């Protein structure tokens, strides 16, 4: 590649200029290194939390500016590094190559591209730890959005800046819940609507690189990589990389949302990020805290999540809605990281172990799941008309709560049980099948109006598909309006009732 030769010439010209203006005579020499942390002397005037460029090639952050020995973790493998190699002060706080161009590119810790697509343009390289907007530059969740999979989403919405959280066991596919959530950035984002745009940016904090390939392929095939920047941090990658990755995602979220367009984020498994912070603290010198994990686990978690918000029109009414994903062991809701985060995030969707093998590909514990904004910022289809359907969702969840071993006191309880159980067998939006703001209310409305409830529970698995297709090719005007008019009016309710009669008939 002659272009590779030109790139080599340009880079070596930059290197020759750097060497000519080295301005590095008293810069530090790495005294010792280990566990991705390097104890380095010198560097007498290094600004705190500024990347340090190391001779072995791998760089790293400088965390603890201790008296004399300034501690810089190594953001790369140690087999290259060695004691005494020169440490070059980058002179800048850790900043991430950020901007709209990164679209479809998988970037390393600070933003080094890793797919092999070459450079990606930048609209700003800001520090990895930005101060979040306060009170006045913040605002309410006045603009709703769609989670894509019905996924108990009309039940508990995910609105502008709704800092929702999740949980699950190993291989719980909560990652897949995230992926489906992202895929909904194709029914609005793939159009041309900024107001409908929610430019998602997933993360990859500590996952097997094979899983990374699976994510990339699933993004391309369903045509998601057009709208999702997936920052990557391999399990084979070094601990400082994984630790800094969530900060990089924060930077990308700032670069997007701060511009004034409504954007979204979904941090990957953040439990690995916590384990990385544990490595960074307990390995460098910092005494451990509660749950044997580093003391500032909450501090790091907040500084990640608290970056997300929904600013006001003063700041452009944009937002960076976030869906941080935490992992437990044994689906443990009661844990230091899990409970502490559930205090930080404004929404929770609990994924169990039984249901993960018991009855639902989604297996989202509807009763356990909750979001701190159900009314404000919910699908206007799911509330403005189906607000009674949301209260019915809560009521039927409470109903199924008591459905374990109680007798048959009456027929009312039994009818509620059968209808709600058909509804639950219905509501699981199949994997990678995001199709929502068209007949969301329909399930509960038909159950209370007795359209689907009269069908067999098992048969609903195809009856729903038939009803949807009938609404599509037969109730096309009414279904398209429910998509677009923004509400299911009493007249549209009557037309949908007619379409429901048609679906019941054929």
């Amino acid at each position: 590649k002659a272009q590779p030769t030109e790139v080599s010439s340009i880079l070596e010209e930059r290197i020759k200029g750097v060497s000519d203006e080295a301005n590095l005579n008293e810069t530090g020499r790495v005294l010792a290194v280990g566990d991705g942390i390097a104890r380095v002397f010198g560097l007498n005037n290094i600004q705190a939390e500024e990347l340090v460029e190391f001779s072995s090639g791998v760089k790293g952050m400088a965390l603890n500016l201790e008296p004399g020995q300034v501690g810089i973790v190594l953001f790369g493998s140690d087999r290259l590094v060695k004691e005494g190699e020169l440490v070059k002060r980058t002179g800048n706080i850790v900043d991430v190559p950020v901007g709209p161009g990164l679209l479809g590119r998988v970037v390393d810790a600070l933003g080094n591209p890793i797919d092999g697509k070459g450079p990606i343009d930048a609209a700003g390289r800001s520090r990895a730890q930005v101060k979040a907007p306060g009170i006045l530059p913040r605002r309410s969740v006045h603009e709703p959005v769609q989670t894509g999979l019905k996924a108990v989403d009309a039940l508990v919405p995910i609105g502008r800046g709704q800092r929702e959280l999740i949980i699950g066991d190993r291989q719980t596919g909560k990652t897949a819940v995230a992926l489906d959530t992202i895929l909904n950035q194709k029914r609005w984002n793939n159009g041309s609507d900024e107001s409908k745009k929610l430019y998602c940016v997933y993360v990859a904090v500590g996952q097997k690189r094979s899983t990374v390939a699976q994510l990339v392929q699933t993004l391309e095939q369903h045509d998601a990589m057009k709208y999702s920047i997936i920052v990557a941090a391999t399990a084979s990658e070094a601990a400082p990389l994984q630790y800094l990755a969530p900060f990089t995602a924060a930077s990308i979220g700032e670069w997007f949302r701060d511009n004034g367009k409504h954007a979204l984020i979904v941090y990957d498994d953040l439990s690995k990020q916590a384990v990385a912070y544990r490595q960074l603290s307990l390995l460098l010198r910092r005494p451990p805290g509660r749950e044997a994990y580093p003391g500032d686990v909450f501090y790091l978690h907040s500084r990640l999540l608290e970056r997300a918000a929904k600013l006001s029109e003063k700041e452009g009414s944009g937002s960076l809605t976030a869906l941080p994903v935490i992992e437990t062991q044994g689906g443990d809701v009661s844990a230091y990281i899990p409970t502490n985060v559930i205090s930080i995030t404004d929404g929770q969707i609990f994924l169990e172990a039984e249901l993960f093998y018991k009855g639902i590909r989604p297996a989202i514990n509807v009763g356990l799941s909750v979001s701190r904004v159900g009314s404000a910022a919910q699908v206007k289809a799911l509330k403005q008309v189906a607000g009674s359907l949301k209260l019915f969702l809560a009521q039927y969840r409470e109903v199924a709560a008591f459905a374990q071993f109680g007798s048959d006191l009456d027929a009312s309880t039994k009818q509620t049980l059968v209808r709600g159980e058909r509804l639950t067998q219905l509501l699981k939006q199949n994997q990678y099948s995001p199709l929502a703001t068209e007949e969301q209310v329909p399930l509960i409305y038909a159950g209370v109006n007795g359209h689907l409830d009269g069908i067999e529970l098992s048969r609903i698995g195809e009856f729903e598909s038939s009803f949807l297709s009938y609404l599509k090719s037969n109730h096309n005007e009414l279904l398209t309006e429910i998509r677009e008019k923004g509400e299911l009016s009493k007249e549209l309710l009557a037309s949908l009732k007619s379409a429901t009669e048609s679906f019941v008939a054929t």
């Binding site: 590649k1 590779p4 060497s19 000519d20 203006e21 080295a22 301005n23 092999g116």
Partner: protein, 51 residues
């Protein structure tokens, strides 16, 4: 065909790097490091005289 092209492009950079190893070995083997020492001295002198 496109995938074959992408793989051959990567093979090109890999072969370029492999020949760059021999190129670097030439730099030490040939005493152009003698011809490089004066250049290093001049560059460092200019750098120190910069400020």
């Amino acid at each position: 065909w496109v995938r074959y092209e992408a793989s051959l492009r990567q093979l090109e950079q890999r072969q370029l790097a492999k020949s760059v190893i021999s190129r670097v070995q030439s730099e030490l083997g040939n005493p152009k490091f003698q011809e490089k020492v004066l250049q290093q001295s001049i560059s460092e002198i200019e750098q120190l005289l910069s400020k």
